[PDB]
Curated annotation (Swiss-Prot), chain A:
PANTHER family xref list: STRUCTURAL MAINTENANCE OF CHROMOSOMES PROTEIN 3 (PTHR43977)
Name assigned to this protein: Structural maintenance of chromosomes protein 2
Family membership: Belongs to the SMC family. SMC2 subfamily.
Residues annotated for ATP binding in this entry: 32-39
Signal peptide region: none
Subunit structure: Forms a heterodimer with SMC4. Component of the condensin complex, which contains the SMC2 and SMC4 heterodimer, and three non SMC subunits that probably regulate the complex: BRN1, YCS4 and YCG1/YCS5.
Function noted in UniProt: Central component of the condensin complex, a complex required for conversion of interphase chromatin into mitotic-like condense chromosomes. The condensin complex probably introduces positive supercoils into relaxed DNA in the presence of type I topoisomerases and converts nicked DNA into positive knotted forms in the presence of type II topoisomerases.
Note: Present with 3290 molecules/cell in log phase SD medium.
Annotated domain remarks: The flexible SMC hinge domain, which separates the large intramolecular coiled coil regions, allows the heterodimerization with SMC4, forming a V-shaped heterodimer.
Organism in which the protein naturally occurs: Saccharomyces cerevisiae (strain ATCC 204508 / S288c) (Baker's yeast)
Compartments in which it is found: Nucleus; Cytoplasm; Chromosome
Swiss-Prot record, chain B:
Source organism: Saccharomyces cerevisiae (strain ATCC 204508 / S288c)
Gene for this chain: YCS4
Subunit structure: Component of the condensin complex, which contains the SMC2 and SMC4 heterodimer, and three non SMC subunits that probably regulate the complex: BRN1, YCS4 and YCG1/YCS5.
Protein family according to the UniProt entry: Belongs to the CND1 (condensin subunit 1) family.
Misc remark: Present with 2540 molecules/cell in log phase SD medium.
Function of the protein: Regulatory subunit of the condensin complex, a complex required for conversion of interphase chromatin into mitotic-like condense chromosomes. The condensin complex probably introduces positive supercoils into relaxed DNA in the presence of type I topoisomerases and converts nicked DNA into positive knotted forms in the presence of type II topoisomerases. The condensin complex probably also plays a role during interphase.
Protein's UniProt name: Condensin complex subunit 1
Entry's localization field: Nucleus; Chromosome
Length: 465, 107
DNA sequence: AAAAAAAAAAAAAAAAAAAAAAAAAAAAAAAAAAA
DNA sequence: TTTTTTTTTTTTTTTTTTTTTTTTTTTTTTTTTTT
């Protein structure tokens, strides 16, 4: 995904529609005076790729990214980026049949942002999954060194140095999804446990009361048949026009008073069981029996579902660990060789922490000569810049991300190492689009494309120098 | 009942049940107070907590005001309730009150 | 020609992550006293 | 003259709360297709 056009509308120092074209796929270099808008170009690229923590875009809010906080006529802030797809090997999934991919993020005042791909709207998970497939994740980057953060890559905790190798291996998108999966499964597990204890306390007691009144309803239906036989015989015998004669000549000579008090003693049980049990309890108990059986089948399938998901993530963790070790060996070898080529008579390796495992975190260890540095706090800003640059280029040598953004990685390097970094990006590390902001001429004089940035009339312009 | 949906249901039910009993020769003598208590109930439901019930009340009042063979006394009270509720908190109840005022001004 | 269905937008409430601030513990450095 | 003890200061790590943004649910509005 080589960037071909970048369209910035209403961003931090950009008040108009600025369209930057003529991007060379090998090495682009942004220059200009101080306060011109170079890091705002890189902040626009970070913003179109998606940020959560707005301190890396240098804002305290989202309306702080619009021009003059949106209170100067430009009430919207939209960033458009266009990617070329003549190389289908680094193309994302599903977008192979489109030679150009446009992504735009818009934010207006008051509300929050909204994304669109190729003109058509999309939520943030779609564009985040689009950019997390060519390892262009901004929320945990292995390609973005912002301004003043080149001498601080070696100050990182071992989980972050592990996460860079994890993003190179391809398993960081599995790791954050696995942690989200465990959290979501815990929340749905306590919800299902509340539902199970509600089923145990509130349903089956009422179900056995329903079974009790079911068997009393069979008794009441026996008395129902008793009424519609005996009371029919009774009202036939006091009615006495030929059918009543035919139903008299089967039971000739039934005693009147005993039949009358038997009718009364049947009707008193009837006026009791009329307010005892409802006459439609059989369809009701069939309905709630089907509901309880389907409910318990659902709970069993949910439990087997959780067991299958848990055993599958436990099986995937082993392949994650094996590809992490296989990535880490090649990356630390190329780390040592690139640091030996940049700074002569030196070496650097990535080592698992003392006593713990490789998948717990990694630490940089630096050799200058034949002595091992016990702590890397005693190194200069230029040496730490070279170790950080050699680590990022080792991650390039494993699996090259398409866009490497470097905001002033040469602020602590001398005039020899700056020209050597420019030469090694122009010659050796082909295979990625480099967007470097520099002020030292030895870096952007070895460039294939140079964009000057200037401040005029209240806005910023980008001129192809 | 604390559910919003059942309150909006029964408010729309009163609105549709007054709005259909407008053809004359069986309405104003067969049921006279059962329809007046529902008109008064739709007037009282302008003050419910969730604004969807207020919106359903105003919409029922606006579909009452179309067919007028009777209850022309109630239209002035609907006008008073609409100009009172023209400055509520939700935009939905305000917009539907503008629609109700336009409906009673056209007719 | 009208009605129904689907998609998008709006409002209110809740949750998660990051940043800033605060507190506690550990280590280092300096000064003084005693054998 | 050296070691030990006490006090003070600084740095790092961990914890807590709030804010902003995002997500979820329901309802409303708009557009398109079918009877
Ligand atoms: Mg800058």
């Amino acid at each position: 995904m080589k960037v071909e056009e970048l369209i910035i509308d209403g961003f931090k120092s950009y008040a108009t529609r600025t369209v930057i074209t003529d991007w060379d796929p090998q090495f682009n270099a942004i220059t200009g005076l101080n306060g011109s808008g170079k890091s705002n170009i890189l902040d626009a690229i970070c913003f179109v790729l998606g940020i959560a923590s707005m301190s890396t875009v240098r804002a305290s809010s989202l309306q702080d990214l619009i021009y003059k906080r949106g209170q100067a006529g430009v009430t919207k802030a939209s960033v458009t980026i266009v990617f070329d797809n003549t190389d289908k090997s680094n193309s994302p999934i599903g977008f192979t049949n489109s030679p150009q991919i446009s992504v735009t993020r818009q934010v207006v005042l008051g509300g929050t942002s909204k994304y669109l791909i190729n003109g058509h709207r999309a939520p943030q998970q779609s564009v985040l999954q689009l950019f997390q497939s060519v390892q262009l994740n901004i929320n945990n980057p292995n390609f973005l060194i912002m301004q003043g953060k080149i001498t601080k890559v070696l100050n990182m905790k071992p989980s972050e140095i592990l996460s860079l190798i994890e993003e190179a291996a391809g398993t960081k998108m599995f790791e954050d999804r696995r942690e989200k999966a465990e959290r979501t499964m815990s929340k749905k597990e306590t919800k299902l446990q509340e539902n199970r204890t509600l089923l145990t306390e509130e349903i089956e007691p009422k179900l056995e009361k329903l079974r009790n009144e079911k068997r009393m309803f069979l008794e009441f239906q026996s008395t129902q048949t008793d009424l519609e036989k005996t009371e029919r015989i009774v009202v036939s015998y006091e009615y006495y026009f030929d059918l009543v004669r035919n139903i008299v000549k089967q039971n000739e000579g039934i005693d009147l008073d005993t039949y009358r008090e038997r009718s009364k003693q049947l009707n008193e049980k009837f006026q009791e069981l009329r307010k005892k049990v409802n006459p439609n309890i059989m369809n009701m108990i069939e309905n709630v029996e089907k509901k309880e059986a389907a409910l318990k089948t659902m709970i069993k399938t949910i439990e087997k579902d959780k067991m299958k998901i848990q055993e599958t993530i436990s099986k995937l963790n082993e392949y994650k660990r094996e590809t992490l070790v296989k990535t880490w060996e090649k990356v630390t070898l190329d780390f040592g060789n690139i640091f030996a080529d940049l700074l002569p008579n030196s070496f650097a390796k990535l080592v698992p922490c003392e006593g713990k495992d490789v998948t717990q975190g990694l630490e940089v260890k630096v050799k200058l000569g034949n002595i091992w540095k016990e702590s890397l706090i005693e190194l200069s800003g230029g040496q730490r810049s070279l170790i950080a640059l050699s680590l990022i280029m080792a991650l390039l040598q494993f699996r090259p991300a398409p866009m490497y953004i470097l905001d002033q990685v040469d602020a602590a390097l001398d005039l020899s190492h700056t020209q050597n970094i420019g030469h090694l990006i122009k010659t050796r590390f082909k295979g990625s689009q480099f967007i470097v902001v520099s002020l030292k001429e030895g870096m952007f004089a070895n460039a294939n494309r140079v964009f000057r940035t200037r401040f005029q009339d209240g806005t910023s312009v980008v001129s192809i120098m | 009942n604390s559910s919003i949906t059942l309150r909006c249901s029964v408010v729309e039910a009163c609105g549709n049940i007054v709005a259909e009993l407008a053809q004359d020769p069986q309405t104003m003598e067969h049921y006279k107070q059962q329809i007046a208590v529902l008109i008064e109930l739709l007037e009282e439901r302008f003050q419910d907590s969730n604004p969807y019930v207020r919106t359903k009340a105003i919409q029922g009042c606006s579909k009452i005001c179309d067919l007028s063979s009777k209850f022309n006394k109630s239209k002035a009270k609907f006008t008073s309730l609409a100009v009172r509720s023209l400055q509520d908190r939700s935009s939905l109840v305000r917009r539907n009150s503008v629609k109700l005022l336009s409906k009673l001004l056209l007719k």
